[PDB]
Design an enzyme around this catalytic site. Structure first.
Site, PDB file in Angstrom:
ATOM      1  N   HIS A  45      56.828 -28.467  63.947  1.00 16.46           N
ATOM      2  CA  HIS A  45      57.272 -27.369  64.814  1.00 16.46           C
ATOM      3  C   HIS A  45      56.536 -26.082  64.437  1.00 16.46           C
ATOM      4  O   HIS A  45      56.519 -25.124  65.204  1.00 16.46           O
ATOM      5  CB  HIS A  45      58.811 -27.222  64.822  1.00 16.46           C
ATOM      6  CG  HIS A  45      59.394 -26.543  63.606  1.00 16.46           C
ATOM      7  ND1 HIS A  45      60.023 -27.240  62.591  1.00 16.46           N
ATOM      8  CD2 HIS A  45      59.522 -25.220  63.288  1.00 16.46           C
ATOM      9  CE1 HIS A  45      60.452 -26.385  61.670  1.00 16.46           C
ATOM     10  NE2 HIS A  45      60.189 -25.152  62.084  1.00 16.46           N
ATOM     11  N   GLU A  59      48.973 -18.163  46.651  1.00 18.48           N
ATOM     12  CA  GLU A  59      49.640 -16.950  47.140  1.00 18.48           C
ATOM     13  C   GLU A  59      50.930 -16.750  46.361  1.00 18.48           C
ATOM     14  O   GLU A  59      51.659 -17.729  46.103  1.00 18.48           O
ATOM     15  CB  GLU A  59      49.954 -17.071  48.652  1.00 18.48           C
ATOM     16  CG  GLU A  59      50.623 -15.872  49.319  1.00 18.48           C
ATOM     17  CD  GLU A  59      49.839 -14.572  49.159  1.00 18.48           C
ATOM     18  OE1 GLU A  59      49.695 -14.106  48.018  1.00 18.48           O
ATOM     19  OE2 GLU A  59      49.375 -14.042  50.176  1.00 18.48           O
ATOM     20  N   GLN A  64      50.718  -7.976  48.811  1.00 15.88           N
ATOM     21  CA  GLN A  64      49.840  -7.356  47.838  1.00 15.88           C
ATOM     22  C   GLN A  64      48.892  -8.337  47.172  1.00 15.88           C
ATOM     23  O   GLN A  64      49.091  -9.528  47.251  1.00 15.88           O
ATOM     24  CB  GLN A  64      50.629  -6.507  46.864  1.00 15.88           C
ATOM     25  CG  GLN A  64      51.136  -7.173  45.662  1.00 15.88           C
ATOM     26  CD  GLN A  64      51.915  -6.195  44.795  1.00 15.88           C
ATOM     27  OE1 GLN A  64      51.708  -6.121  43.580  1.00 15.88           O
ATOM     28  NE2 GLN A  64      52.803  -5.421  45.426  1.00 15.88           N
ATOM     29  N   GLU A  69      44.453 -15.693  45.328  1.00 18.87           N
ATOM     30  CA  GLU A  69      44.547 -16.308  46.680  1.00 18.87           C
ATOM     31  C   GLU A  69      43.205 -16.875  47.097  1.00 18.87           C
ATOM     32  O   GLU A  69      42.165 -16.331  46.731  1.00 18.87           O
ATOM     33  CB  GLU A  69      45.018 -15.256  47.698  1.00 18.87           C
ATOM     34  CG  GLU A  69      46.313 -14.566  47.288  1.00 18.87           C
ATOM     35  CD  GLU A  69      46.122 -13.207  46.613  1.00 18.87           C
ATOM     36  OE1 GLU A  69      46.904 -12.279  46.932  1.00 18.87           O
ATOM     37  OE2 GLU A  69      45.146 -13.014  45.844  1.00 18.87           O
ATOM     38  N   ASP A  93      59.254 -34.417  62.379  1.00 21.83           N
ATOM     39  CA  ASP A  93      58.796 -33.022  62.252  1.00 21.83           C
ATOM     40  C   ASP A  93      57.803 -32.905  61.088  1.00 21.83           C
ATOM     41  O   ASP A  93      58.146 -32.491  59.973  1.00 21.83           O
ATOM     42  CB  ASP A  93      60.018 -32.074  62.080  1.00 21.83           C
ATOM     43  CG  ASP A  93      59.657 -30.623  62.265  1.00 21.83           C
ATOM     44  OD1 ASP A  93      58.501 -30.362  62.645  1.00 21.83           O
ATOM     45  OD2 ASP A  93      60.548 -29.752  62.046  1.00 21.83           O
ATOM     46  N   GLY A 186      60.919 -19.271  58.481  1.00 19.13           N
ATOM     47  CA  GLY A 186      59.744 -18.878  57.731  1.00 19.13           C
ATOM     48  C   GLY A 186      59.539 -19.775  56.490  1.00 19.13           C
ATOM     49  O   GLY A 186      58.437 -19.809  55.895  1.00 19.13           O
ATOM     50  N   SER A 188      60.239 -23.053  56.996  1.00 20.20           N
ATOM     51  CA  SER A 188      59.904 -24.275  57.717  1.00 20.20           C
ATOM     52  C   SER A 188      58.543 -24.793  57.269  1.00 20.20           C
ATOM     53  O   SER A 188      57.632 -23.993  57.111  1.00 20.20           O
ATOM     54  CB  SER A 188      59.737 -23.921  59.209  1.00 20.20           C
ATOM     55  OG  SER A 188      60.959 -23.704  59.912  1.00 20.20           O
ATOM     56  N   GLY A 189      58.374 -26.106  57.136  1.00 18.36           N
ATOM     57  CA  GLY A 189      57.068 -26.635  56.783  1.00 18.36           C
ATOM     58  C   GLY A 189      56.855 -26.708  55.282  1.00 18.36           C
ATOM     59  O   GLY A 189      56.050 -27.509  54.815  1.00 18.36           O
TER      60      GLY A 189
END
Ligand code: CA
Length: 240
Positions: A45, A59, A64, A69, A93, A186, A188-189
């Site tokens: 999704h 990350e 900042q 990263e 999903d 946020g 999700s995944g």
């Protein structure tokens, strides 16, 4: 993550931030798990919209510079072919992203460990959800990576009437539901990391919470059960 605490910088080095381009900037939208130098596992999704996406590895703070990263474009989006956006409760999903470049591994960037196919956790197994998702229902994203202790709730309990009933399938993992800690938009995944024989493995891909809100008693956060999808994941990676 509602009711979380700030993760240490090197705790969860497979966690990624999946972002989309909005004007001249980039916005975090979902989590994922780095599974090969050039593949990320996330939720289907998360990539339903026709957006330009990038992945950030290593990350910690979205707002900042961490000095750690690596930023990489998404070359190919392979969604599970049975995924239906109008039916998150049907399952499937899950999606795999092929990255445009292979990332470099270090303390902050590692492949996520995945469970053996078919593995199911005992009820109340210890897991942490991680992510930059909202810190309250209808709240705002975390700047720094959060983690929350979310013990699993087995299928027999999770699929009972006072929990999620028939909304939950055996291809999902439920965790938490204490009314205080949960995943939230946020997240999700992203991964649910569970401890089995001394080793954290990514047993879940965050999928959904109640329409009533994120931290709702007897509505544990629901995740795609990674161990139901091992053959699918291998098959994709072998042929792309
Ligand atoms: Ca940063």
């Amino acid at each position: 993550v509602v009711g979380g605490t700030e993760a240490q910088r090197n705790s969860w080095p497979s966690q990624i931030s999946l972002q989309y381009r909005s004007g001249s900037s980039w916005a975090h939208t979902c989590g994922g798990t780095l599974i090969r130098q050039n593949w990320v596992m996330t939720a289907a999704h998360c990539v339903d919209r026709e957006l330009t996406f990038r992945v950030v590895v290593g990350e910690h703070n979205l707002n900042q510079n961490n000095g750690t990263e690596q930023y990489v474009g998404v070359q190919k989006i392979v969604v599970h072919p049975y995924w239906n956006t109008d039916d998150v409760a049907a399952g499937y999903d899950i999606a795999l992203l092929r990255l445009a470049q292979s990332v470099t591994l270090n303390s902050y960037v590692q492949l996520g460990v995945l469970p053996r196919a078919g593995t199911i956790l005992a009820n109340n197994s210890p897991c942490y959800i991680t992510g930059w998702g909202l810190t309250r229902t209808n709240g705002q994203l975390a700047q720094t990576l959060q983690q929350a202790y979310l013990p699993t709730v087995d299928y027999a309990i999770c699929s009972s009437s006072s929990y999620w009933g028939s909304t939950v399938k055996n291809s999902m993992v439920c965790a938490g539901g204490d009314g205080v800690r949960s995943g939230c938009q946020g997240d999700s995944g992203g991964p649910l990391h569970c401890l089995v024989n001394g080793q954290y493995a990514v047993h879940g891909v965050t999928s959904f919470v109640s329409r009533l809100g994120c931290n709702v008693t007897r509505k544990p956060t629901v995740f795609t059960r990674v161990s139901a999808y091992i053959s699918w994941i291998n098959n994709v990676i072998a042929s792309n």
